[PDB]
Each structure stands twice: as C-alpha cells, then as structure tokens.
Amino acid sequence: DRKAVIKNADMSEDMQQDAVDCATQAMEKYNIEKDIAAYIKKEFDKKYNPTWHCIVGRNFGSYVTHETKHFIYFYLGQVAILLFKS
Amino acid sequence: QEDKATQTL
C-alpha cells in the first residue's frame, strides 16, 4: 500500500527501519495526523529514551535542532514524517 | 546538536 522513502536521515539503519515500522503501525490504527504523531513520539520515548518530537503531515516546512544521530525525515505515501530528539 | 530544514514538495 504505502511507499516508504527516507528523504533525510541522521540516524542508524536499525532506528530508521524502526521509525518506518512504527509509523506504519500508527497509520493502520489512526487517521488523524496528530494521533499518528503522538503514537510515534510515545513509542520512541519508550524505546530510545525521551525526549522525541514528531510532526506528521502533507504540507509543512520546518527548521529544528536535533541531537546527533537522532533525526529522520521520511514519506509514507503522501504523508511526511519528521521525528527527532532535542 | 545540528540544524535541519525540511520542506514537503
């Protein structure tokens, strides 16, 4: 169903794949961007320690400051997902 | 800590 494309990453392979699997699970459960984002954020806090932030949407730009090795920006279908730690 | 820009197309 949904094409996964990593646009920009400062993040290990395993964590990248986890971010995609996590977003895929979120999208199976939830349709609202904010709820998808909450699920990913909370899972990443739980597995990789706080504090994570997550943005999900079709139309946004951003300028954020992340901890090294804790950043990914990717598409699942037409939905863009920004996940990072600061 | 590093700075990153993203933009949907």
UniProtKB/Swiss-Prot annotation, chain A:
Signal peptide: none
Compartment list: Cytoplasm, Cytoskeleton
Record-marked site positions (Interaction with myosin V motor complex): Y39
GO molecular function annotation: dynein intermediate chain binding; identical protein binding; protein-containing complex binding; scaffold protein binding
Pfam families assigned: Dynein_light (PF01221)
Gene Ontology terms describing biological process: microtubule-based process
Cellular component annotations (GO), alphabetically ordered: 9+0 non-motile cilium; centrosome; ciliary tip; cilium; cytoplasmic dynein complex; cytoskeleton; cytosol; glutamatergic synapse
The keyword Transport appears for this protein: yes
Record keywords: Cytoplasm, Cytoskeleton, Dynein, Microtubule, Motor protein, Transport
UniProt main location, coarse: cytoplasm
InterPro entries: DLC_sf, Dynein_light_1/2_CS, Dynein_light_chain_typ-1/2
UniProt keyword Transport present: yes
Source organism superkingdom: Eukaryota
Family: Belongs to the dynein light chain family.
Protein function: Acts as one of several non-catalytic accessory components of the cytoplasmic dynein 1 complex that are thought to be involved in linking dynein to cargos and to adapter proteins that regulate dynein function. Cytoplasmic dynein 1 acts as a motor for the intracellular retrograde motility of vesicles and organelles along microtubules. May play a role in changing or maintaining the spatial distribution of cytoskeletal structures.
Oligomeric form and interacting partners: Homodimer. The cytoplasmic dynein 1 complex consists of two catalytic heavy chains (HCs) and a number of non-catalytic subunits which present intermediate chains (ICs), light intermediate chains (LICs) and light chains (LCs); the composition seems to vary in respect to the IC, LIC and LC composition. The heavy chain homodimer serves as a scaffold for the probable homodimeric assembly of the respective non-catalytic subunits. Dynein ICs and LICs bind directly to the HC dimer and the LCs assemble on the IC dimer. Interacts with DYNC1I1. Interacts with BMF.
This protein's name: Dynein light chain 2, cytoplasmic
Species whose genome carries this gene: Homo sapiens (Human)
Gene: DYNLL2
Swiss-Prot record, chain B:
Region (Interaction with DLC2): 3-9
Source domain of life: Eukaryota
Tissue specificity annotation: Isoform 1 is mainly expressed in B-lymphoid cells. Isoform 2 and isoform 3 are mainly expressed in B-CLL and normal B-cells.
Spans through the membrane: none
Quaternary organization: Interacts with MCL1, BCL2, BCL2L1/BCL-Xl, BCL2A1 and BCL2L2/BCL-w. Interacts with the myosin V actin motor complex through its binding to DLC2.
Record family assignment: Belongs to the Bcl-2 family.
Record function comment: May play a role in apoptosis. Isoform 1 seems to be the main initiator.
Protein name, UniProt field: Bcl-2-modifying factor
Gene behind this protein: BMF
